[PDB]
Amino acid sequence: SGVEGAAFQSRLPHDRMTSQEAACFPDIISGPQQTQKVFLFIRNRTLQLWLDNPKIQLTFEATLQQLEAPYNSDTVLVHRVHSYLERHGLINFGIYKRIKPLPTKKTGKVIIIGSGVSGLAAARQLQSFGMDVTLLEARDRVGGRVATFRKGNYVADLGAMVVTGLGGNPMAVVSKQVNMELAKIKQKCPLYEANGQAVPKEKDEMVEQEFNRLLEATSYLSHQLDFNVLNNKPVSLGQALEVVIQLQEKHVKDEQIEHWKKIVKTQEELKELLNKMVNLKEKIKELHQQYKEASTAEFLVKSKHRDLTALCKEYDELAETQGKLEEKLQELEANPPSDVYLSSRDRQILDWHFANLEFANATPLSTLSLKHWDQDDDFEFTGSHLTVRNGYSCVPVALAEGLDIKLNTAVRQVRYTASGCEVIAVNTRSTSQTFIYKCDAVLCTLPLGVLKQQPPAVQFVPPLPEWKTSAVQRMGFGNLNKVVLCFDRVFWDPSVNLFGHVGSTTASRGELFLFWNLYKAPILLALVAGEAAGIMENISDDVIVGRCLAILKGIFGSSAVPQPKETVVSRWRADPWARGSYSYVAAGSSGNDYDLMAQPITPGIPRLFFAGEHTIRNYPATVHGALLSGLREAGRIADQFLGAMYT
Ligand SMILES: Cc1cc2nc3c(=O)[nH]c(=O)nc-3n(C[C@H](O)[C@H](O)[C@H](O)COP(=O)(O)OP(=O)(O)OC[C@H]3O[C@@H](n4cnc5c(N)ncnc54)[C@H](O)[C@@H]3O)c2cc1C
Numbered sequence: 001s002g003v004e005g006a007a008f009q010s011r012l013p014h015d016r017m018t019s020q021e022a023a024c025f026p027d028i029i030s031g032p033q034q035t036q037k038v039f040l041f042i043r044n045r046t047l048q049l050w051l052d053n054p055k056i057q058l059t060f061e062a063t064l065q066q067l068e069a070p071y072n073s074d075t076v077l078v079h080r081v082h083s084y085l086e087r088h089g090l091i092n093f094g095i096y097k098r099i100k101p102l103p104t105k106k107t108g109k110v111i112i113i114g115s116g117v118s119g120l121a122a123a124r125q126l127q128s129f130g131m132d133v134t135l136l137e138a139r140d141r142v143g144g145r146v147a148t149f150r151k152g153n154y155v156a157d158l159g160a161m162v163v164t165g166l167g168g169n170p171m172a173v174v175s176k177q178v179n180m181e182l183a184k185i186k187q188k189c190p191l192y193e194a195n196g197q198a199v200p201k202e203k204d205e206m207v208e209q210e211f212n213r214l215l216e217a218t219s220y221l222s223h224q225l226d227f228n229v230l231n232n233k234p235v236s237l238g239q240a241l242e243v244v245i246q247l248q249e250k251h252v253k254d255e256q257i258e259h260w261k262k263i264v265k266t267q268e269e270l271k272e273l274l275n276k277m278v279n280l281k282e283k284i285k286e287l288h289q290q291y292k293e294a295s296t297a298e299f300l301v302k303s304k305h306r307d308l309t310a311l312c313k314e315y316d317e318l319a320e321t322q323g324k325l326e327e328k329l330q331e332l333e334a335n336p337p338s339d340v341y342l343s344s345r346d347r348q349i350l351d352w353h354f355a356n357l358e359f360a361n362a363t364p365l366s367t368l369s370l371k372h373w374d375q376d377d378d379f380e381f382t383g384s385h386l387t388v389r390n391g392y393s394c395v396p397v398a399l400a401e402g403l404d405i406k407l408n409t410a411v412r413q414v415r416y417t418a419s420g421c422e423v424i425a426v427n428t429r430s431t432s433q434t435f436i437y438k439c440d441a442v443l444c445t446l447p448l449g450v451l452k453q454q455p456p457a458v459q460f461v462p463p464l465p466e467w468k469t470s471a472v473q474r475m476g477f478g479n480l481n482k483v484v485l486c487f488d489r490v491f492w493d494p495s496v497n498l499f500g501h502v503g504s505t506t507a508s509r510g511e512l513f514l515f516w517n518l519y520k521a522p523i524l525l526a527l528v529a530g531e532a533a534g535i536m537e538n539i540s541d542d543v544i545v546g547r548c549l550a551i552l553k554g555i556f557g558s559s560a561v562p563q564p565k566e567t568v569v570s571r572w573r574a575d576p577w578a579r580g581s582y583s584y585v586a587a588g589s590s591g592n593d594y595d596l597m598a599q600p601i602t603p604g605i606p607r608l609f610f611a612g613e614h615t616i617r618n619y620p621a622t623v624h625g626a627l628l629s630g631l632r633e634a635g636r637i638a639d640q641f642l643g644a645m646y647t
């Protein structure tokens with residue numbers, strides 16, 4: 001119904017109790033039988049109230065004076081539940097019209113490094129929780145990896161772009177709090193070969209099926225044959241993909257020989273029978289004559305014929321088998337089995353499919369861990385993916401509308417004593433060059449690519465533990481850029497949301513393999529994935545944009561493709577503040593390292609906390625994952641520097 005709906009939108013079992021909820025309400029409800037029944041209801045009921053209007057602060061009081069006959073009778077458990085929820089950011093999170101103003105007297109000082117979605121997400125929580133929160137963004141703007149290009153009437157989105165489902169997506173709440181227009185993505189997508197050729201629907205279907213076919217084989221080798229460690233080395237997805245393919249290439253060369261074989265075993269039978277026949281032609285030739293000339297004419301001529309009968313008559317089975325066989329020799333030479341697994345043209349189309357996976361996981365397929373690159377799948381939201389029409393930057397800007405964000409300052413050192421901790425940052429685009437932030441706790445929102453920067457970029461007085469950094473280095477941070485093309489008008493099909501360009505070579509199959517049309521203005525978004533992404537980051541926007549034009553008027557109008565009025569090209573590897581797209585499970589790593597990343601570090605009570613895209617295990621590499629990780633720490637921190645929820 002409706003109350004049980006909210007539970008789902010909150011990623012919570014409706015009739016069950018979270019491992020967490022169990023803890024905060026220790027048998028106080030995990031004791032009797034039908035007393036928890038009530039509990040859960042009071043939970044879902046609130047979850048519902050909040051969700052039905054996340055543009056306002058859902059008060060304990062408001063929650064109370066809105067419950068049914070029983071429930072609101074026991075005023076105490078309600079509060080218990082409400083606080084619990086409000087603490088974990090299941091209600092009153094994001095940006096809402098606050099009732100009951102913040103406490104002028106804040107408690108504790110928290111320094112949050114970076115102001116990405118996880119940063120802002122956390123910030124606000126803590127703020128609301130009644131704490132002193134200051135964000136140090138080293139980038140003249142908020143939103144980090146949610147970067148939107150805004151020039152005149154054009155809107156682009158070089159960072160996050162898609163909102164993958166609204167089924168249990170916290171982003172569904174934020175999205176309506178901010179009044180951000182989302183739009184569904186037309187699945188239809190046509191593939192144009194490296195010539196413009198639209199690729200016949202049937203070929204596109206066979207190959208794509210053979211893609212899903214291959215990929216699933218891969219899954220079998222992994223989860224059914226434990227083909228995860230070959231030669232004390234970790235198996236990568238791409239490694240396995242190449243195994244399965246090579247195996248189907250085997251079946252082909254195989255049933256190819258079973259054929260050639262029996263064609264020959266028959267060619268030999270006719271030749272072995274032709275001799276038997278040519279040899280019988282003599283016997284029926286030597287006799288046939290001694291018959292006519294010796295036609296002695298008593299019981300003799302009566303027999304030469306009895307003889308010639310048998311011979312001419314046995315010469316029938318031969319000439320009869322000959323045909324039979326001689327003709328079956330055609331049921332073979334006339335119907336060969338497939339001579340090749342995939343045509344050179346096929347593979348290229350197949351590669352596009354690979355590139356499309358590389359685009360998703362933001363890393364060459366070779367880099368992926370055969371066993372865990374899927375690991376998070378069990379939590380994907382329900383409902384179709386949407387595009388933001390007015391620019392994703394809405395969310396972050398909106399979310400920053402009330403906190404003190406120390407922009408343009410770059411944290412280059414983090415100190416943490418058993419007691420307080422110091423943060424030293426530098427300024428860059430404003431008269432300064434050295435600051436020092438003293439505070440109780442540090443919330444690190446630094447992207448995995450930065451924590452990986454060799455040099456490195458930021459230092460941690462007591463160095464980060466063994467376990468930590470070793471996890472940081474074995475995880476994966478990928479890359480993937482975009483090529484924005486602002487035009488004079490639409491020269492492409494308006495009812496199509498996306499179309500692909502088949503690549504030339506397996507390597508560089510990700511080179512501008514997918515154009516994207518999602519806006520009002522005449523604007524296409526070109527994608528560079530796979531190993532092409534990093535390399536391409538070394539070319540002029542001009543040259544890159546030129547390769548786009550070709551492919552374009554190559555598939556469209558005979559040079560009936562205008563000159564882009566405007567143009568942008570992203571380079572996330574280079575961005576010193578990002579160092580790549582987002583994480584991915586690399587061969588050797590696993591879903592555990594995401595957990596170790598969340599792990600707070602305590603000096604020789606905890607000081608250093610981490611959040612961000614690379615911190616959240618079942619929602620990595622996403623904006624909602626970042627936001628959830630954000631809320632998570634915000635809560636965790638306030639449980640130590642304030643108190644823990646009871647029942
Ligand atoms: C091309 C591309 C496409 C994507 N598409 C999607 C998509 O469709 N959907 C989706 O859900 N996700 C997508 N993502 C990823 C998503 O945007 C990120 O996962 C998310 O923004 C990460 O959140 P974060 O809070 O960790 O912040 P950022 O990743 O926002 O990280 C922290 C912030 O700190 C700043 N900072 C860095 N170094 C320092 C320093 N030394 N001192 C101080 N501040 C510093 C950064 O500039 C940044 O603002 C995409 C990413 C890329 C690159």
Ligand SMILES: [Hg+2]
Pocket residue numbers: 189190191499500
């Ligand atoms: Hg397509």
Ligand SMILES: [Hg+2]
Pocket residue numbers: 213217
């Ligand atoms: Hg197979």
Ligand SMILES: [Hg+2]
Pocket residue numbers: 178393394395398
């Ligand atoms: Hg906005």
